[PDB]
Design a binder for this molecule. Structure first.
Ligand SMILES: O=C(CCCN(Cc1ccc(Cl)cc1)Cc1ccc(Cl)cc1)NO
Ligand SMILES: [Zn+2]
Length: 391
């Protein structure tokens, strides 16, 4: 499938897909064991105390809404790290099992962040923050380009997000460039909603984050200071009825702003005369971007409007949490905002508990009908209710 190597946390390092790495945090970090599960995608089974050294403490503060959960010990043992890795891999395979999921992951892999790191406007150069440093046998580090990192949560165990390292001048997630995305996520816990008490399928939560990743990799994310209190980026990602709270005129304004940023990238490509890096042919990197941005006898690049509009709508309207819900054939909350306040400990790793094809709604069993697999009372053995953080 999507992840052809069924990695174990204990597997020895090989420096190609199982290696100790440093993320571009801009601080001195100890190297952590990471796993390249697919091309351009790594998984770090560690609590996220690296992406933002300011939030390196796993102690609790309580956050009113959404619901929160704190454990300072979760994801500290090798066995938890193994289960985390297997849990994330299973969810990647669950997403990939769908046509929409297969599409989104392919779009993510092609979404290489733009080589806009040079001082000279005619020179292409990778931006350091879009790379990881991979340890070699002699202790030196080699720079590796990547699109996506799945990382364990920071202090609030159930606070999941798609974040990335910024630039001093450039707004990478809003200028068309894109930047490497870090998703804080855990397959080991889920949220309950009401419709009757049901649990959110973690593949839906993961697909949600990969939708933000998709936007941010293509540099088309909606500024987080554009709200409704809910950001347009969040409404768009969730989709369904909630996405329609973004008016037609704001939607056209964004569509046009990004046709223009894609125009600027196509021109930067056309003016490029040089390239930094050893294994980095100028024509190879022009083709990477040509493939990513779906650009159109002389080598001069252009933005086809019908291709742009198709690609833009692909990322912003087809890749939505709502459509993944329809594809996974599961039950999910009706609106993005949800104040139910119910957290459940889960184990989706065993086939007896959760499968790539049915999720918790196992076929040919009492759980296949009426989303009983997601019913926290019917399938009570699959969901251990935890105490919500209060103080
Ligand atoms: O979108 C996010 C954050 C997670 C979204 N949450 C929904 C939410 C609920 C209440 C408020 Cl005030 C704001 C957001 C988590 C969430 C998911 C499922 C459920 Cl059932 C409840 C909460 N990250 O990309
Ligand atoms: Zn979100």
């Amino acid at each position: 499938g999507f992840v052809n190597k069924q990695f174990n946390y204990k597997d020895p390092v090989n420096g190609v897909d199982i290696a100790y790495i440093k993320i571009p945090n801009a601080g001195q970090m100890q190297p952590v064991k990471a796993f390249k599960i697919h091309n351009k995608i790594w998984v770090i089974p560690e609590r996220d105390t690296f992406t933002n050294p300011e939030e390196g403490d796993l102690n609790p503060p309580a956050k009113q809404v959404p619901v929160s959960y704190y454990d300072s010990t979760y994801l500290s043992t090798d066995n938890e790290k193994d289960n985390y890795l297997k849990g994330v891999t299973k969810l990647f395979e669950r997403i990939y099992s769908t046509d929409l999921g297969r599409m989104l992951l392919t779009s993510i892999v092609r979404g290489i962040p733009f080589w806009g790191g040079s001082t000279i406007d005619t020179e292409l150069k990778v931006i350091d923050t879009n790379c990881i440093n991979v340890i070699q046998p002699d202790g030196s580090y080699r720079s590796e380009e990547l699109n996506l990192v799945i990382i364990g949560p920071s202090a609030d165990i159930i606070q999941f997000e798609c974040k990335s390292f910024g630039h001093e001048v450039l707004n990478l997630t809003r200028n068309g460039y894109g930047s490497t995305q870090y998703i804080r996520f855990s397959p080991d816990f889920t949220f309950g909603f009401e419709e009757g008490k049901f649990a959110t399928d973690p593949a839906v939560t993961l697909a949600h984050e990969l939708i933000h990743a998709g936007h941010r990799l293509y540099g088309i994310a909606i500024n987080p200071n554009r709200v409704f209190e809910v950001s347009f980026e969040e409404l768009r990602t969730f989709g369904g009825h909630d996405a329609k709270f973004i008016d037609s005129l704001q939607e056209n304004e964004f569509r046009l702003y990004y046709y223009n940023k894609f125009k600027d990238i196509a021109s930067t490509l056309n003016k490029a005369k040089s390239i930094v890096g050893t294994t980095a042919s100028l024509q190879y990197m022009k083709n990477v971007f040509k493939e990513k941005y779906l650009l159109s006898t002389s080598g001069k690049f252009s933005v086809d409007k019908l291709k742009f509009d198709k690609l833009y709508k692909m990322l912003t309207e087809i890749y939505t949490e709502d459509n993944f819900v329809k594809f996974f054939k599961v039950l999910n909350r009706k609106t993005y905002l949800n104040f139910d306040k119910a957290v459940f400990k889960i184990n989706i790793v065993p086939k007896v508990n959760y499968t790539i094809y049915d999720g918790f709604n196992l076929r040919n069993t009492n759980l296949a009908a009426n989303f009983n697999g997601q019913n926290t009372e019917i399938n009570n053995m699959n969901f251990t209710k935890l105490k919500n953080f209060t103080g």
